[PDB]
């Protein structure tokens, strides 16, 4: 029912955007079918973890607070695809980072995917009293993500910023705000119960779950094989400010740090294996278990504090944390 409704609204959103281009933007059918194939390629295929979270938060606030039910659920599906389209926009920009027409189309695809989030919001929420507040919070979170990408890209240019506090700043702005906090806020806006929750505890939970999610991703990028991870890990070659790097530099000797700096950020297969050897000898995978356990305790405690004022809203956060844990 949730996934089936989320994909049914996708056909409604896609049909409007493509017909709007045909009727109001004078687009030929050849480009309409081109943009339909591009939209399905970039937006469909994922697990829809961000989009379905908006649905799970909305369905809890309407039953635990009937023409209003069908509207709130449909509004959450549109907001769910706004984030999925936004995620597709970020992924397209990442492919460009790593008269050529394929690059011109990639840049154009990234602009259309972002603008489509505004077009589907200005239409399905044209008469909603929260249209102005939704666009402002959506644009501020998108601006937050762009700032987080500046922290991540320039994390090794200005190992001084290879600290645990700066790592949290990267995860917070680059990932946690739009992946965990944005779906929760959008579920509150479509349910008209936004000021009825403690945003401080809600924001604190979103940053902890994103931190828990990024630490697990950093370890799998280095140790999980490519066929079992789904991609090729490249954090060591790209000199990323990963959780393994900032934790190794804290418990390593002067020679181990010198050997780390002489091998980190290189594409050599032996230098990357040297960095993995330093991570293995430092027992970082043992500290990874203890670090994630402490974060999980902080999540289980803040949900109860959020439950004292948001009983149903905390039930969706546990489900959100359940799929992260």
Ligand X SMILES: CS(=O)(=O)Cc1c(Cl)cccc1Cl
Contacts to ligand X from residues 25-64, by CB under 6 A: 49-50, 53
- Check residue 239 for interaction with a second copy (CB under 8 A): yes
Residue 166 or 324 with smaller CB distance to ligand X: 324
Q: How long, in residues, is the chain? A: 325
Dihedral sign (CA 206, 207, 212, 218): positive
Residue 172: CB minimum distance to a second copy, A:
8
Look up residue 147 and give its two tokens. 């700032």
75 among annotated binding-site residues: no
Under 8 Å CB-to-CB from 3, ≥6 apart: which residues? 48, 52
- Residue 213 binding result from ligand X, a second copy, none, given CB thresholds of 5 to 8 Å by partner type: ligand X
- Residue 50 binding result from ligand X, a second copy, none, given CB thresholds of 5 to 8 Å by partner type: ligand X
- Check residue 212 for interaction with ligand X (CB under 6 A): no
Look up residue 47 and give its two tokens. 């697990």
98 among annotated binding-site residues: yes
Residue 99 or 230 with smaller CB distance to a second copy: 99
- Check residue 180 for interaction with ligand X (CB under 6 A): yes
Residue 173 or 288 with smaller CB distance to a second copy: 173
> Which residue is associated with the tokens 């902890």?
208
How many residues touch a second copy (CB under 8 A)? 48
Tell which residue, 37, 50, 44, has the closest CA to residue 10.
Answer: 44
- Residue 179 binding result from ligand X, a second copy, none, given CB thresholds of 5 to 8 Å by partner type: ligand X
235 among annotated binding-site residues: yes
Task: Check if the beta carbon of residue 283 is closer than 8 Å to that of residue 147.
Answer: no
- Check residue 173 for interaction with a second copy (CB under 8 A): yes
Under 8 Å CB-to-CB from 319, ≥6 apart: which residues? 56
Nearest-angstrom CA–CA distance, 252 and 38? 47
- Calculate the CA 323 to chain-centre distance: 14
- Check residue 266 for interaction with ligand X (CB under 6 A): no
Nearest-angstrom CA–CA distance, 174 and 165? 14
Nearest-angstrom CA–CA distance, 49 and 80? 9
Give the three-state DSSP class for 242: coil
Dihedral sign (CA 197, 179, 264, 272): positive
- Residue 169 binding result from a second copy, ligand X, none, given CB thresholds of 5 to 8 Å by partner type: a second copy
Give the three-state DSSP class for 98: coil
Contacts to ligand X from residues 182-211, by CB under 6 A: 183
Per CB under 6 A, which region of 60-68, 128-136, 138-146, 179-187 contacts ligand X? 179-187
> Which residue is associated with the tokens 């280095």?
222
221 among annotated binding-site residues: yes
Residue numbers after which the chain is interrupted (C to N above 2.5 A) read: 65, 98, 158
- Residue 215 binding result from a second copy, ligand X, none, given CB thresholds of 5 to 8 Å by partner type: none
Nearest-angstrom CA–CA distance, 180 and 324? 10
Residue 31 or 305 with smaller CB distance to a second copy: 31
Contacts to a second copy from residues 148-167, by CB under 8 A: 149-151, 153-154, 157-158
Residues of this chain that interact with ligand X (CB under 6 A) are 49-50, 53, 179-180, 183, 213, 320, 323-324
Binding-site residue positions for Mg(2+)? 94-95, 98, 152, 217, 221, 235
Residues of this chain that interact with a second copy (CB under 8 A) are 21, 25-27, 30-31, 93, 96-101, 103-105, 107-108, 111-112, 115-116, 118-119, 122, 131-132, 135-136, 139-140, 142-144, 146-147, 149-151, 153-154, 157-158, 169, 173, 237-239
């Amino acid at each position: 029912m949730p996934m089936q409704m989320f994909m049914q609204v996708y056909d409604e959103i896609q049909m409007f955007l493509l017909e709007e281009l045909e009727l109001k933007f004078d687009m030929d059918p050849n480009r309409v079918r081109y943009l339909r194939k591009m939209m399905d390629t970039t937006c469909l295929g994922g697990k829809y973890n961000r989009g379905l979270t908006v649905i799970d938060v909305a369905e809890s606030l309407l039953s635990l607070s009937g023409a209003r039910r069908k509207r709130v659920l449909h509004d959450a599906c549109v907001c769910g695809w706004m984030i999925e389209f936004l995620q597709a926009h970020y992924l397209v920009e990442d492919d460009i980072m790593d008269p050529d027409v394929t690059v011109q189309c990639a840049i154009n695809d990234g602009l259309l995917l972002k603008s489509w989030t505004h077009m589907m919001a200005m239409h399905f929420f044209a008469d909603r009293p929260f249209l102005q507040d939704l666009l402002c919070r959506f644009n501020r979170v998108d601006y937050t993500t762009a700032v987080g990408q500046l922290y991540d890209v320039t994390s090794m240019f200005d190992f001084a910023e290879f600290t645990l506090s700066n790592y949290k700043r990267i995860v917070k702005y680059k990932t946690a705000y739009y992946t965990y906090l944005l779906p929760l806020v959008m579920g509150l806006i479509v349910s008209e119960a936004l000021p009825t929750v403690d945003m401080g505890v809600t924001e604190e939970l979103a940053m902890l779950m994103g931190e828990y999610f990024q630490v697990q991703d950093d370890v799998m990028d280095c140790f999980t094989p490519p066929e079992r991870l789904g991609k090729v890990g490249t954090d060591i070659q790209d000199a990323k400010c990963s959780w393994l790097a900032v934790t190794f530099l804290a418990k390593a000797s002067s020679a181990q740090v010198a050997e780390f700096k002489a091998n980190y950020g290189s594409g050599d297969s032996e230098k990357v294996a040297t960095v993995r050897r330093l991570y293995e000898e430092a027992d970082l995978q043992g500290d990874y278990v203890a670090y994630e356990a402490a974060v999980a305790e902080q999540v289980k405690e803040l949900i109860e504090k959020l439950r004292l004022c948001s009983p149903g809203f905390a039930a969706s956060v546990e489900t959100l944390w359940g799929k992260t844990y």
